[PDB]
Nucleic acid binder design. Structure first.
Lengths: 37, 157, 129, 146
RNA sequence: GGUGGGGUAACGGCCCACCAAGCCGAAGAUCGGUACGGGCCGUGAGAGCGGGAGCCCGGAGAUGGACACUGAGACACGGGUCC
RNA sequence: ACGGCUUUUCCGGAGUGUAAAAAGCUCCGGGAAUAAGGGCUGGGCAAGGCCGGUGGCAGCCGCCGCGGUAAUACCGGCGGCCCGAGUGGUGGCCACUAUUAUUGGGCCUAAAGCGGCCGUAGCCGGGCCCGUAAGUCCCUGGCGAAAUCCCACGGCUCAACCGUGGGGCUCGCUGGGGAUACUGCGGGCCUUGGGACCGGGAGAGGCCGGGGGUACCCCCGGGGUAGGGGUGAAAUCCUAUAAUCCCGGGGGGACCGCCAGUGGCGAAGGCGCCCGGCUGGAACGGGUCCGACGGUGAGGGCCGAAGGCCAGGGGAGCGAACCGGAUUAGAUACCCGGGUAGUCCUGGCUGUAAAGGAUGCGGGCUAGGUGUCGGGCGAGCUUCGAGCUCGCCCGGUGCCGUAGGGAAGCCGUUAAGCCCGCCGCCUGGGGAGUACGGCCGCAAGGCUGAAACUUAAAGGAAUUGGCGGGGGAGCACUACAAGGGGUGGAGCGUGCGGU
RNA sequence: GGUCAGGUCGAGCCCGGGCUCCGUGAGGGGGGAGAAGUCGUAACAAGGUAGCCGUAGGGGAACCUACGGCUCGAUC
RNA sequence: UAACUUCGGGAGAAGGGGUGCCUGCGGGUGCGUAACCCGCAGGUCGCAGUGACUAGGGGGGCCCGACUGUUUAAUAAAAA
């Protein structure tokens, strides 16, 4: 993933590490749904 | 700075501004040429010949003497060797770099995990290729000359 | 590495003038640098300059009089005709006829004023004001 | 952290390539060249459009403001797309009935979008049955039947 | 690309027979998108950016295509044939 | 209001105009007779702090903002301000915008330097001498239609318009002559940049082999009885099959304590026991050697914390997942007792970090002062030490700081100053590092990478105050400590809430 | 000019395969606006267990834990 | 010559053109004008030239079992 250090700041937003984890889970779910595994 | 380490060392020679050989030099041009030939036959490189001449014989530099056979040139160790038919077949710096690259490859084939020495080898090959490019451009090497580690062993030997 | 001895000389002169030095050394020296220094001395921006041999390209010893506001090389060396000098004057000088644009011409190195007087163009190599 | 490059006399190709490459970061130039607005414009690049009123709605005013904003749903004759158009005027909504043809016209918001405290509305009604809504609201003209 | 011809008002792979593997390309080939080109027009102090319907010159088209006759000139907007 | 005056225009006529008409032009009759609207009125931005209506509704608002019963901001009336036969509204282009930056932008903390090196095309390149005129400059022929553009004069009343001359434009092409400073090309001569070599030294630079250091865990034997561990307090757990603890032995797997230091060596990631072998680089001292061999580098190559994956070994101590005990309203955690993968070796893959100096690399210049490491030189001590002290030169590594720079924090010869080069990256915040497509990978994942739509801010430095289950000084019987009497339990008086 | 044969240019129709798109499709996925809902309190002070990056595993949800790293860390 | 894919496959995917006889040349191996095989040009006949004989029809979804294999000799060969 591309680096956006501006998003690591916690002012009015949740942790970027857990956002990244959620996005990766979403990507895996979409790939599984599409059948690409 | 340095080619790869990018350090700014400044140690080197500081030759005074001169146009003629110093008056206290005992030997003449002919004896200087004979000494150069004798040292080359003994088996020293050009740098070692010049160092020995400066140290033991007290000759500051052969480049201070005008060439008797060419009014437009000054004397030089390589020029003396080439006029006596004793110049090296390939340039000495290239020979030294090839020799130590071959030695490093011999070490690395017994120590495959020495990645730092492998990087040193890569730097040596880069220097070799730079010199090969320069000598190819200047015509001091055949146009078909290429550097290959397998064939470099015979050149080293 | 070293690429522009003339630009190095002009930047060194500008820095020394800003810091208030009276004497500068230019190294390495060249005939283009000598011609430029001759033009500046003729126009009164620098004092006496002398060439010194050191077994190398040489050194130039120059005396400054505190009369230079800014001296700089022009890169790329733009070719300029006789009728195109006004835009370069506006680009490199504060007012009309204030400084001098040093131009290398086919008849030698001379200021843009003498180039206009002779009716010849050249290549802009420096500017001093 | 260095002198801006290229600066050489024979580097015009590299300079032009750099300028062309970095001109794509400009959103305005990229949108104009790729015709992105034309690809999604309901009005197809027109300054005004004609349509038929489908229904009348009211919109919340955005915070910190509060109030009803009367709008209509208009189906464009050009392509059948449905948009929402504001009805400027103190009693403009009274003069607009169902199945009435109207002339919608852009709203002068930032860029080309919405304005004021009504986001999501980009158009306003100007003419109703070929009669201007301003004159209808001010009472100088009487609405025809259509 | 060549060797020999045919055809054309003319030179030409334009076409044919034979002989070779050439030609183009990260300095943007091929493919895709858009677009008649220019003199010019709009704007800006200028560099520049944007447009290029009206007038002039040049190019194409006559519902979409393909063909021919006559004539110096057409495969022809107000001549011809077929789909 | 009164008294006058013309007629551009309007109305009616006569000529002239036109192929014929019309318009236009000249003249007569009548008469101020026929002729002003559009936006705006809170700032930006010129214009009212007046009145009447609505009252978070109706509405206005490009942006900031107004409206809640005293609205200069909504509607209306009366005033006014801008332009004016025009004046508003919407879409599009340029300027605004140095927010596309050749002129002429930025990348430490705000958007942005590839995690780091080697190197190919390209771009940029040290000094001198001779030769050619390709680039370059000057002069001179053939061109680049007209209209359009600028100026002067002349003709329609002046003007718009047109004519006569001068110039410009078509970003240029081409035939010749001249010049040689710079670039290009060919030749010659150099050593300053960069390489090669020699000498004495420095260093946790790397690989292999062999010896150790305590510590910790387990097993056996002897001693010795009742607890041990652990926490804020406990509990799970170990213990009578003899635990914790002490002593004599055996076995194993990680790691090299103090010394140790803004110390040292490496491109970076990283690298501390000792000895031997192999091996990379740098600094210093070099009247040594070659002679521009150089810098940066699109594509490409190599190295690359931890973690994860494949195959084979090992597994002491820690310890994701998991089990149990505590705390809590809940506690899928913080705390405690156990524990699989992993952490360790070998052959490979993955190529990711706040991989940070949030600062790419080469060169020249711009006050100093003060530590420390390596080398060299000079002087003085000496137990003659590879020892100590002081000064100077070079190369690394820190702090303070002048000129100057910056929004500031701060940087300041180890620049974030001025100059000469090269590559990479950024163009308001989200959507989004997402969707689609392509490449690599066993997989996890890696690289490339948008739109629709949404938003007026997001972001940085610094100031005053307020707060902290931050740190310090103080003060208080409406705070405590040490004490005296009470209220809260009952009836009643009185004042509240509720009914 | 008819008829029969070849030779060419060749419209139209049919079949198969590429490319540029355009419309829709029950149902799922996240995203953005919404105003005065429910659960807990993750970050800002040492935010009550310092925060954050990389990898990996768990949890209604913010989040929790392990290894390596930075200070964009308070006290000392 | 497609989706997909375990990268091996799917695949002879799908789909399109040709095929006789006669005359004469060229090529490969070969000492050979011995034998076998592979091309080229022209002429010509029929409705049809692998003319008889020999000799796949094909494609797209879904369920089950991975596959080759075995089974109720005498009603079940399958998903068992």
């Amino acid at each position: 993933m591309k680096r956006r250090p501006r998003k690591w700041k916690k002012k009015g937003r949740m942790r970027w590490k857990w956002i990244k984890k959620r996005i990766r889970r979403l990507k895996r779910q979409r790939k599984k749904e599409r059948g690409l595994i | 700075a340095r080619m790869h380490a990018r350090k700014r060392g400044k140690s080197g020679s500081k030759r005074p501004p001169r146009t003629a050989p110093p008056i206290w030099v005992e030997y003449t041009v002919e004896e200087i040429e004979n000494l150069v030939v004798k040292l080359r036959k003994e088996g020293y490189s050009t740098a070692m010949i010049g160092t020995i001449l400066r140290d033991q014989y007290g000759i500051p530099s052969v480049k201070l003497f005008k060439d008797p056979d060419n009014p437009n040139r000054n004397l030089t160790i390589t020029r003396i060797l080439e006029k006596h038919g004793l110049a090296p077949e390939i340039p000495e710096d290239l020979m030294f770099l090839i020799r130590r690259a071959v030695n490093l490859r011999k070490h690395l084939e017994q120590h495959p995990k020495d990645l730092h020495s492998m990087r040193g080898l890569q730097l040596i090959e880069s220097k070799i290729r730079r010199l090969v490019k320069y000598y190819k451009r200047k015509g001091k090497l055949p146009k078909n000359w290429r550097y290959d580690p397998e064939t470099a062993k015979l050149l080293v030997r | 590495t070293l690429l522009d001895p003339l630009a190095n000389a002009l930047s060194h002169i500008t820095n020394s003038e800003r810091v208030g030095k009276r004497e500068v050394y230019i190294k390495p020296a060249s005939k283009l640098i000598g011609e430029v220094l001759r033009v500046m001395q003729k126009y009164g921006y620098i004092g006496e300059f002398e060439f010194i041999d050191d077994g190398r390209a040489g050194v130039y010893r120059v005396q400054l009089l505190g009369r230079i506001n800014k001296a700089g090389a022009i890169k790329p060396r733009f070719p300029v005709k006789v009728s195109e000098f006004e835009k370069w004057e506006k680009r490199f000088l504060p007012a009309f006829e204030f400084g001098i644009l040093i131009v290398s011409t086919s008849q030698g190195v001379m200021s843009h004023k003498e180039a206009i007087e002779k009716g010849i163009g050249g290549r802009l190599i420096a500017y001093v004001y | 952290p260095g002198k801006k490059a290229p600066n050489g006399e024979f580097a015009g190709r590299k300079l032009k390539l750099k300028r062309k490459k970095f001109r794509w970061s400009d959103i305005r130039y990229k949108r104009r060249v790729l015709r992105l607005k034309e690809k999604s414009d309901p009005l197809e690049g027109a300054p005004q459009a004609r349509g038929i009123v489908l229904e009348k709605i009211a919109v919340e005013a955005k915070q910190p403001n509060s109030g009803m904003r009367k709008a209509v749903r208009v189906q464009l004759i050009k392509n059948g797309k449905v948009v929402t158009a504001f009805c400027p005027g103190d009693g403009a909504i009274k003069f607009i009935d169902e199945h009435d043809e109207v002339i919608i016209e852009g709203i002068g918001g930032p860029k080309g979008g919405s304005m004021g405290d009504i986001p999501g509305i980009r158009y306003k009604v100007v003419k109703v049955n070929r009669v201007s809504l301003k004159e209808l609201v001010k009472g100088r003209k009487e609405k025809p039947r259509r």
